[PDB]
Amino acid sequence: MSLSVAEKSYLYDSLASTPSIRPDGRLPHQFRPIEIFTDFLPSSNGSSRIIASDGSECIVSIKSKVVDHHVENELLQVDVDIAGQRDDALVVETITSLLNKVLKSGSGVDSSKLQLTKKYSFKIFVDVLVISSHSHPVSLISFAIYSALNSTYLPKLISVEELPTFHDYDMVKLDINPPLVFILAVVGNNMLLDPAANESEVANNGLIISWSNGKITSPIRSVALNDSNVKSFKPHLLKQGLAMVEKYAPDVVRSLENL
Amino acid sequence: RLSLQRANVEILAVEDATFSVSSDLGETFRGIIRSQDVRSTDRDRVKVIECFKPGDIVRAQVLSLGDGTNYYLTTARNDLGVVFARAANGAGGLMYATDWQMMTSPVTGATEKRKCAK
Amino acid sequence: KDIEISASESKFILEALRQNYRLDGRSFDQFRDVEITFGKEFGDVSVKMGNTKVHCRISCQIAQPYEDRPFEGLFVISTEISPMAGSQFENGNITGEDEVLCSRIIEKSVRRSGALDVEGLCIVAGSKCWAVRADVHFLDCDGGFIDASCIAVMAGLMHFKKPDITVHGEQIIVHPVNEREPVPLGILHIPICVTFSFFNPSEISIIDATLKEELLRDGVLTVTLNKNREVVQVSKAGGLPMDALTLMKCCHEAYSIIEKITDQILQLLKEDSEKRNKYAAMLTSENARE
Amino acid sequence: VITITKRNGAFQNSQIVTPGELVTDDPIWMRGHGTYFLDNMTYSSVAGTVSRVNRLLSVIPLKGRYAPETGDHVVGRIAEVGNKRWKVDIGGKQHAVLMLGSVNLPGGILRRKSESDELQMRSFLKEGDLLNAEVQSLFQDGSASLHTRSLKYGKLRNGMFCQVPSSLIVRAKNHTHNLPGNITVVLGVNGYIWLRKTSQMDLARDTPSSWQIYSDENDPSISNNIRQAICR
Amino acid sequence: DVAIENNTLSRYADAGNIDTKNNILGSNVLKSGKTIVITSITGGIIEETSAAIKDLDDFGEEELFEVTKEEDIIANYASVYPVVEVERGRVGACTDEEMTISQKLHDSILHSRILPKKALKVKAGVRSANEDGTFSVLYPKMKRKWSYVLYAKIVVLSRTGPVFDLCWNSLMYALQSVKLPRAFIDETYEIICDQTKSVPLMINAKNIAFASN
Amino acid sequence: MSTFIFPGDSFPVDPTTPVKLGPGIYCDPNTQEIRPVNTGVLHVSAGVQTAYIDYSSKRYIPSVNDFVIGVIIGTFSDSYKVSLQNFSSSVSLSYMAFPNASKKNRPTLQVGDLVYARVCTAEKELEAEIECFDSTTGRDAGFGILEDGMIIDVNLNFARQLLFNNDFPLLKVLAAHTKFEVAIGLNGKIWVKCEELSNTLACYRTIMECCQKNDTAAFKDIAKRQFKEILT
Amino acid sequence: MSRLEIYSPEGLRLDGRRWNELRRFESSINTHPHAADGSSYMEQGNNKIITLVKGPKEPRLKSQMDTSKALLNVSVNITKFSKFERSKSSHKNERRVLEIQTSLVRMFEKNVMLNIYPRTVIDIEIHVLEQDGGIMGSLINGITLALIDAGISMFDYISGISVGLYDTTPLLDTNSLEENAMSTVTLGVVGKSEKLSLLLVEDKIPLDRLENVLAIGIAGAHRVRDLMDEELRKHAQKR
Amino acid sequence: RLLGPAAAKPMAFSNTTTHSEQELSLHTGFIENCNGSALVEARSLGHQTSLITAVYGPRSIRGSFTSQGTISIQLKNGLLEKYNTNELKEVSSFLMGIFNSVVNLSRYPKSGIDIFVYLTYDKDLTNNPSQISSLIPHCITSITLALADAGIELVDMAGAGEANGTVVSFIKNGEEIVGFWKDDGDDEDLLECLDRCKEQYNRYRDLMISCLMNQ
Amino acid sequence: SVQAEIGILDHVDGSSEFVSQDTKVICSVTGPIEPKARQELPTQLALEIIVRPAKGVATTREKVLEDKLRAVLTPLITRHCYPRQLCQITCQILESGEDEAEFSLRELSCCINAAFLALVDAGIALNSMCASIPIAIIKDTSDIIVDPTAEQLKISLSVHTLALEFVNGGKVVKNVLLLDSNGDFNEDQLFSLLELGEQKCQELVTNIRRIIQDNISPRLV
RNA sequence: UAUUAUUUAUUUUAAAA
């Protein structure tokens, strides 16, 4: 739902206080309960479904294609499709352009782990289907592509240059370090991790931070969360948010790589 | 646009006699001249077809913001009304104001009733 | 921007149906008299059935086949409707329900059901093939849009002729239409559509409803048969729920119509072929001995 | 820390009647909701339990939105400012209508002529505002007609909004209650709840006009312990 | 009054420092009054097949072709495929103005006989792999044939009236400043254009025209 | 004096004699010359000398003192919304434009009802207005709802010839076969009604066929063959 | 796979079933409670469909409001990964979707009592996660089960079943491989009756063979209604 | 006609056939269609950039009842170095999140402002083989120029700079950050990125006022 | 000699069919009718011009064909006596009668003649009459020919479309509505064909006046 | 100010006297 200007000023004064009074009252580093299903699409090499606390849901499918990397530039393509939105929408093309940067072959994802012959390699097709969304889902999708890439199985290669052949039954597991994306909301001088729906509506600005190989990696953004209260932030808040994810990201990876 | 009880107009200028006026610019305002605000003598029960025509230039003082979408204008003054019109909805000659509710073109000689301003 | 039907007009037409009366004077199982007219160029056909008038235009060009079927030719069809057939149609409304359903039914009847010999349209496998296109122009709308359009396309495909091709090793040369006479397409069977309109005051079904009857309709059914007693395609979605007995009666009644219409197209094509081949008796090369 | 429930392998983890089946063949009945009449017999249109009250035969479906009735202390949000009325989001099948002659106007009546009726309403009751009112009457389609003709109903502020299913609202004499910790709850029968700090009116009226209620200005100083109480 | 700047955006702007990752074969920046016209010309290459009856090696079919063939004067000339983009502060698809100007430029270039088809032929080469001279290209009947395809994009800024005359005059300047990159094949073998060597487009100055309303 | 004329032709009337402008001729607001704009037969009547052109047309243009058959397409607070012809602009029918009207009583007319009215206002820059009783003469007989029956589409020249010219044998040849009641609208509409539907159906088919066959002498054979066919 | 036997003399098909045996039918209700008013996860064979019903609600714009009934909008989203080969979006592939969506709207607008819900709209959002033949029939089953979950009043069930005809032997619930080798008929049977609300024949079938195919089609569709009905009984008694 | 023959292929150039200071030039006010114009050009090392920005506003939105204004920024390809349409709209949403914190939105009720940036020429002269990061600072300076020329209220000037794919936009003489963009780059580096961009921001902050006070 | 029919279509106000050589164009006119919000003109009549090709979809080629056909019919219609109204003029090209990829004058000329006849059948207020002919000059023998065949177009140096405006019995050429010329020509050839065209259009309206009179006269009384 | 209103009408309670 929307929010009235009366309760908007109520949340701003309570969140910006030195004791951050969250709506649900969690800590600025606590996340909401998440349900993640994996391995349910037989036709796909990997699949996952994630259900957020506010009813948000996202489905990821992973297909593969044998391609010559000498002629195929990007070996990892992300195709996002938000329900109720057009394919040429701005809210879709931005996340599509952003997810292809966190999962860029040779950057956030090393192209060596999906190579085959000297001539050929595997191309990963990550298709995203956002069934329901209440806030910016770039962080919820990153969790879904994480659990899907860590459960993906690609056909095993059987090996003068000739076209490659694969075994009939046996398949190898795709071992790739999948980057993670976090959303941070600044409300005055307080930094919040995983902002809710109503929380992201009164925030002064937002932060997007990637995380791969146990460290902060490119890209990172500072996109707004609502056109109403867009406020410039002190550089110490950027450092505080960039340092807060370093303190709690391993707690996420440990709680996310268990599958 | 002429309705039975209102006359939709398009604001082209405004006072700053000096004024201010701006094509593909996309910047234009519009108002509504209600029948109750056409004249001061006998406000109710008038005929806007005999006071305005589509394409006529009207000098009118604003009353207030109508419904956000349109403004509310009035012409219940001697200096407010049609200030530049043409015969047969622009298909004739340049008419000029004469009486308080009569407008005529010199060359063609045709007369048409308006709500003039003089 | 739509058609207004008065309450008295709706009641009169329905009550007339309850008394076995159609305003035009046809029976409930009577198809409108179809009239095929051929233009100058091949593949130019104008169909008139009642006040409904439709004009078709066949064309072809070299195209890339589908990688799933490198040995078949393509078939394209567009059934856009202009305000010419009635101001209720908006120009540029290509995704309308009438436009989509008309294209899909003729596409299934021609391409999918093997009416057009797509394998004969293969030039070079996986590279060169004929893409036979069918353009349909709705001239005057008095109902029976897809019924008239299916007769126009099927008459145009049998009247259309493609440029000739000679196979010379690995080379292939397309003769200009001015040198060699073009070659006709391969038409296996001739599917003809028949649309049924249903009403309820014990239901009444009429064949090939006019525009006025089409607006007071409670349910529509489209069947497509050929003279080979084959059910090419059937489309029924919603409206009055019907059972298998009512459908089979519609199919048997439609077969009596599509069989006569088939013989007419074959006869009207033969008459048009002789009109434009007056001196064809002198130019015969393969002749009998003695 | 995060609690991530993980699953692998699959996609996920009285009389009952279904739509289309026969509930009774007795013509002497009064068909209610979830029930349709056909050929002197009675069939079900939804999936639920059969209800019998006197002669009213109906089927209560499982899942269902809020059905507004006459005299309901509801909490709704303003959707749009329409011609001589408001569209308030109650949570039913349709938006409920709040007529102009059914609220406590600021200056008593409209100050005209100057602006239209609709533009003058947005000055104190814009889109998205949250308030509470009572369903005065119902339309033929089931739409609710609200009214704010008392000091008890007004524009909500100084609190936070939460939503629960409408079926989980136990009926009681009082709609709003005072809670320990200087907090007041507004249990709307439509499922909309408004948790706010106890005000001067609800504390002094439940225990034993002007545009001051249409003001969006929150309370200046709220205790930090009171706001954290609303979260719990 | 008009002011133009040719080859300003072109790949061959500097004869000494020819750009590597440039694509424009020739450009022109025109400004008449307050309207601004920017016109660049990229290009591609297409392989043409020999569908002629001469390859049948039959005298009868060839004689029948020569008798029945009718003269087609404009068939020996090609045209450019322009893309007009008049910036008027709007969003959406192509305006009726942009589409009409593109069609007029195509129809006038074709009828005025600016680009004959023989003037867009590709003198095909074969680059060799001699010993440690890495590569070497040679230029001259060959089997495979090619033809140049010219694409033009026009961006009109600060439009104050009819701009078709300005788009045409800006295109006639850019056409008189394009160079066709020489092409060659290696020794699955697609064609490659030269990195620096190029030949200017032989446009007959007899047929070039200018616009005025 | 009747002659065929074309647009742009010279008007065969001297500018000395004052001539009244009718439908077909146009007075240029600039050059003040009288010139034709339509294609048809020119008519000039030798006190007042009027001139007009009789052109073939099917799109009805509202003109005052015209009897039309309209279809109600919209009910409102104080007026109906009537359509005189498809795709055309709708006309206005006020609730006070009825015999024995009252502001406290809404007329019993719904959408889809056929009304026989009179055009009382036809301003080019405004919406046309109709009424179901003559505001000038007080007439009311014949105006109002056309219950049941069937409406027919004809060109404007066929409808005008049927209402005005008493020599048009269509009405006479129809009475020779069946008794009926007819209402002719100048907007190309003809409403007929008989006791039995079979008679009304034959009247519909005859008026349809007689409209396209301009041979007036063939109306007798049309009704003879049409009424004889429905007997089968 | 490869060259297979469609209907062996031993009465066994290529996937092991028999002529009158359906694929496995696992339906689910209320799978998306916090994202729609009606939810149904349809899993018929390898077909995986998510059907979401959002309504009846106020229309976002008054341009789509009916003062006498509700508006029914069916949106079918066929994912890029529904098949083996990840299909790329084609301009021709959009026409087939519109025909399916229109056929579904016209089908359920006659069975759903839209008069009870005036001035409202009912959005049906469908996501096909995997398809393996008989996709049209499975789409019908998902809509019927999702509308019931949303409490939308209907006259009866609408069961979707697909029947194929191989030589002279009809086969129930055709999969993808069988549709590629025979003619296919999809049916929309209303409840336990023998009345059809949908009949799509997209391939050639002899007229003398169509009578029997419909009989076996409406029969097997009654079995589909039982499987859907039983799922609603178990979900209502356990809650 | 348009598009041309589908069988034609674009030209291919082979790499084996034959072989501190960042210049700036600013202009404003030259498009009659819009209210405020701008033209920024920069040529450093083997990469030349030249783009044009036009501002059409404020435009009164019919029937709108918003309290503050709405900014619409749209990037559009030009004639050289064409980027994908997805990444262009990504920079557009990043730019809109910047100017919504700079442009006085409360001073424009029931109206919107439409920005049009045309990347007319993005030359690159590298010897032998995200590239969009080198244009974000130049686009921010171009919009602020055209927004100031259009008489639109802007709370302080806005500029940015690049530091190996790291783009940071400052305000109040670098006191507060209004935008953050970083593609590729390395790790640990952050203090030197904010420093190299801040000195580049002050270089652009005063050069924009130079051409704005002359002419 | 040319063929033309009137009132062929039922569900429109006015229709026509014009034939020349092999070019066939069917045109329909409906108006005055209710215009769209983006179409209405406050003082005069709005036109909706639509021409559709015989093959394929409507491309940008027919867009400039609409713009030229619009420039001819707009001064030919008394737009001011239909304020806030719409007129839908739709031309359907049945056969092109020429090489569509090379020439489009034989279709433009027929659309003008078909639209004018359809406007007469509809009853729209026309300020005058109109005639249109295609003109070409042959390469070898620079001879001006009126209404050239399809083969003569492929052997021509320049092609021309002349649309004139006739008043007073079809004898006084009031103005030159449209003269569209493409190819190679100089000032002497222009006035040579312009003078030749003025007398070929003059006998066209004389034949058009006879065509429409043979149809409208049996309708009226 | 719903026995109020919307004009090419988004009113969805116009019934009683």
Curated annotation (Swiss-Prot), chain C:
GO molecular function per UniProt: mRNA 3'-UTR AU-rich region binding
Keywords from the UniProt entry: Cytoplasm, Exosome, Nucleus, RNA-binding, rRNA processing
Assigned GO CC terms: cytoplasmic exosome (RNase complex); exosome (RNase complex); nuclear exosome (RNase complex); nucleolus; nucleus
Gene3D superfamilies attached to this UniProt entry: GHMP Kinase, N-terminal domain (3.30.230.70)
GO biological processes: exonucleolytic trimming to generate mature 3'-end of 5.8S rRNA from tricistronic rRNA transcript (SSU-rRNA, 5.8S rRNA, LSU-rRNA); nuclear mRNA surveillance; nuclear polyadenylation-dependent rRNA catabolic process; RNA catabolic process; RNA processing; rRNA catabolic process; TRAMP-dependent tRNA surveillance pathway; U1 snRNA 3'-end processing
Location of this chain's protein in the cell: Cytoplasm; Nucleus, Nucleolus
Main localization, broad class: cytoplasm
Function: Non-catalytic component of the RNA exosome complex which has 3'->5' exoribonuclease activity and participates in a multitude of cellular RNA processing and degradation events. In the nucleus, the RNA exosome complex is involved in proper maturation of stable RNA species such as rRNA, snRNA and snoRNA, in the elimination of RNA processing by-products and non-coding 'pervasive' transcripts, such as antisense RNA species and cryptic unstable transcripts (CUTs), and of mRNAs with processing defects, thereby limiting or excluding their export to the cytoplasm.
Extra remark: Present with 4800 molecules/cell in log phase SD medium.
UniProtKB/Swiss-Prot annotation, chain D:
Biological role stated in the UniProt entry: Non-catalytic component of the RNA exosome complex which has 3'->5' exoribonuclease activity and participates in a multitude of cellular RNA processing and degradation events. In the nucleus, the RNA exosome complex is involved in proper maturation of stable RNA species such as rRNA, snRNA and snoRNA, in the elimination of RNA processing by-products and non-coding 'pervasive' transcripts, such as antisense RNA species and cryptic unstable transcripts (CUTs), and of mRNAs with processing defects, thereby limiting or excluding their export to the cytoplasm.
Gene that encodes the chain: RRP4
Extra facts: Present with 4840 molecules/cell in log phase SD medium.
Record localization: Cytoplasm; Nucleus, Nucleolus
Record keywords, A-Z: Acetylation, Cytoplasm, Exosome, Nucleus, Phosphoprotein, RNA-binding, rRNA processing
A GO molecular function held by the record: RNA binding
Principal subcellular localisation of the protein: cytoplasm
Domain S1 motif: start-end pairs: 69-149
Listed GO biological process terms: CUT catabolic process; exonucleolytic trimming to generate mature 3'-end of 5.8S rRNA from tricistronic rRNA transcript (SSU-rRNA, 5.8S rRNA, LSU-rRNA); nuclear mRNA surveillance; nuclear polyadenylation-dependent rRNA catabolic process; nuclear-transcribed mRNA catabolic process; poly(A)-dependent snoRNA 3'-end processing; RNA catabolic process; RNA processing
GO cellular component: cytoplasmic exosome (RNase complex); exosome (RNase complex); nuclear exosome (RNase complex); nucleolus; nucleus
Keyword Membrane appears in the UniProt entry: no
From Swiss-Prot, chain E:
A GO BP annotation: RNA processing
Entry GO terms, CC: cytoplasm; cytoplasmic exosome (RNase complex); exosome (RNase complex); nuclear exosome (RNase complex); nucleolus; nucleoplasm; nucleus
Protein keywords: Acetylation, Cytoplasm, Exosome, Nucleus, Phosphoprotein, RNA-binding, rRNA processing
GO molecular function, one term: mRNA 3'-UTR AU-rich region binding
Main location as per UniProt: cytoplasm
Top-level taxonomic group: Eukaryota
Mutation effect (A183T): Interaction with RRP46 abolished
Subcellular location: Cytoplasm; Nucleus, Nucleolus
Function: Non-catalytic component of the RNA exosome complex which has 3'->5' exoribonuclease activity and participates in a multitude of cellular RNA processing and degradation events. In the nucleus, the RNA exosome complex is involved in proper maturation of stable RNA species such as rRNA, snRNA and snoRNA, in the elimination of RNA processing by-products and non-coding 'pervasive' transcripts, such as antisense RNA species and cryptic unstable transcripts (CUTs), and of mRNAs with processing defects, thereby limiting or excluding their export to the cytoplasm.
Further remarks about this protein from its record: Present with 3180 molecules/cell in log phase SD medium.
Family in the record: Belongs to the RNase PH family.
Protein name: Exosome complex component RRP43
Gene source species: Saccharomyces cerevisiae (strain ATCC 204508 / S288c) (Baker's yeast)
Lineage, broadest ranks: Eukaryota, Fungi, Dikarya, Ascomycota, Saccharomycotina
Full protein segment contained here: 51 to 296 of 394
UniProtKB/Swiss-Prot annotation, chain F:
Pfam assignment, any one: KH_6
Residues in coiled coil: none
CDD domains linked to this entry: KH-I_Rrp40 (cd22526), S1_Rrp40 (cd05790)
Cell location: Cytoplasm; Nucleus, Nucleolus
Listed InterPro entries: Exosome_RNA_bind1/RRP40/RRP4, KH_dom_type_1, KH_dom_type_1_sf, NA-bd_OB-fold, RRP40_KH-I, Rrp40_N_euk, Rrp40_S1
A GO BP annotation: CUT catabolic process
Keywords: Cytoplasm, Exosome, Nucleus, RNA-binding, rRNA processing
MF GO annotations: manganese ion binding; RNA binding
One cellular component term from this protein's GO annotations in UniProt: nucleolus
Domain S1 motif: 63-133
Subunit annotation: Component of the RNA exosome complex. Specifically part of the catalytically inactive RNA exosome core complex (Exo-9) which may associate with the catalytic subunits RRP6 and DIS3 in cytoplasmic- and nuclear-specific RNA exosome complex forms. Exo-9 is formed by a hexameric base ring of RNase PH domain-containing subunits and a cap ring consisting of CSL4, RRP4 and RRP40.
UniProt family annotation: Belongs to the RRP40 family.
Comment field (misc): Present with 6050 molecules/cell in log phase SD medium.
Protein name as annotated: Exosome complex component RRP40
Phylogenetic placement of the source organism: Eukaryota, Fungi, Dikarya, Ascomycota, Saccharomycotina
